[PDB]
Design a protein around this ligand. Structure first.
Ligand SMILES: [Ca+2]
Ligand SMILES: [Ca+2]
Ligand SMILES: [Ca+2]
Ligand SMILES: [Ca+2]
Ligand SMILES: [Ca+2]
Length: 338
């Protein structure tokens, strides 16, 4: 005698379509968070004070009394305990409505409850840290490499147990620093780092920062990244001045310090290693120390009063010839009397 609502007509007949009500419950969430359980459409039977009592007649699996209670007058559905989807994926219940006047003529309707999977696993990186390498002469857009050889790209793999293994988890990656220097690719299971701006080893040789993944709900633990900027020979050995006027004296004798030249090269290792050489002009009377740049009188040589000299001095770094850099200094020497 009571009918569940809505009554959806079965065309070409006088019959109401039997109802299967629908609810859905986020796995592992609590009653307090979820209650009351929203049912679509809302549960209601008709014939203030309806005089109708609602209850759950039967359901499968038979665990359901442990998880659900229905209010007799309101048909309100209350969760009693959080549901683990590993153990329970769904419930199918039958709802009874009957009159309370003492003449029950029960009606029945279905209620289907889905237990929903949720984004409830934090994303994660498959390494505890990442070491990258980049040459300072690399252009914008260059990919950071995973080795000194610079032959293969630094691979950053971010996964998420909420997503299928072979499927892209579509994570967002936050950098905590240097976001105007480096950027991370925005799609894919494997991410890479590229240059937004050229880097100069002589300004900064190392970059340390961390990356955090985000799945729309939870963040990963931050993962630490170090990037090493490798030297290019892009600095030239440089004297303080183009030329130097210096005077020597008749009394001076072989071995005596004539002048100390000092050039500067900011590059790393042998790229910054300077070698000095007199190309021409010493006329046998002066020599220079290959590594110190100090010029002195040559052995078995005496100054003559009038003599002048023009020494052409070269400073070069010890990069391979193809990349070698040098500059020239000219040293004018005149002998004087004390
Ligand atoms: Ca997740
Ligand atoms: Ca999940
Ligand atoms: Ca440089
Ligand atoms: Ca150099
Ligand atoms: Ca350099």
């Amino acid at each position: 005698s009571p009918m569940f609502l809505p009554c959806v007509l079965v065309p070409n007949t006088r019959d109401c379509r039997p109802l299967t009500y629908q609810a859905a419950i986020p796995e592992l969430r609590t009653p307090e968070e979820l209650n009351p359980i929203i049912v679509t459409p809302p549960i209601q039977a008709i014939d203030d004070r309806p005089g109708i009592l609602y209850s759950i007649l039967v359901g499968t699996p038979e665990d359901y009394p442990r998880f659900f209670h229905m209010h007799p007058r309101t048909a309100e559905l209350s969760l009693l305990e959080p549901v683990n989807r590993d153990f329970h994926q769904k419930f199918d219940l039958v709802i009874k409505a009957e009159q309370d006047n003492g003449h029950p003529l029960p009606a029945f309707a279905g209620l289907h409850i889905e237990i929903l999977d949720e984004n409830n696993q934090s994303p994660y990186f498959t390494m505890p840290s990442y070491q990258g390498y980049i040459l300072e002469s690399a252009p914008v857009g260059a990919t950071i490499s995973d080795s000194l050889n610079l032959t293969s790209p630094l691979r950053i793999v971010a996964l998420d147990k909420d997503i299928e293994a072979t499927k892209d988890p579509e994570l967002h990656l936050f950098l905590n620093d240097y976001t105007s220097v480096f950027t991370v690719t925005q799609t894919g299971i494997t991410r890479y780092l590229t240059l937004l701006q050229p880097v100069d080893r002589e300004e900064q040789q190392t970059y340390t920062f961390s990356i955090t993944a985000f799945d729309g709900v939870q963040e990963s633990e931050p993962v630490i990244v170090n990037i090493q900027v490798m030297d290019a020979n892009d600095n030239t050995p440089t004297f303080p001045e183009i030329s130097y006027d210096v005077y020597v004296y008749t009394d001076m004798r072989p071995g005596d310090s004539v002048i100390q030249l000092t050039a500067v090269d900011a590059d790393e290792g042998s790229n910054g290693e300077i070698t000095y050489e007199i190309l021409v002009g010493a006329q046998g009377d002066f020599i220079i120390n290959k590594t110190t740049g100090l010029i002195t009188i040559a052995p078995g040589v005496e100054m003559i009063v009038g003599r002048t000299y023009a020494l052409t001095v070269q400073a070069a770094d010890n990069a391979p010839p193809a990349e070698r850099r040098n500059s020239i200094c000219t040293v004018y020497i005149e002998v004087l009397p004390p």
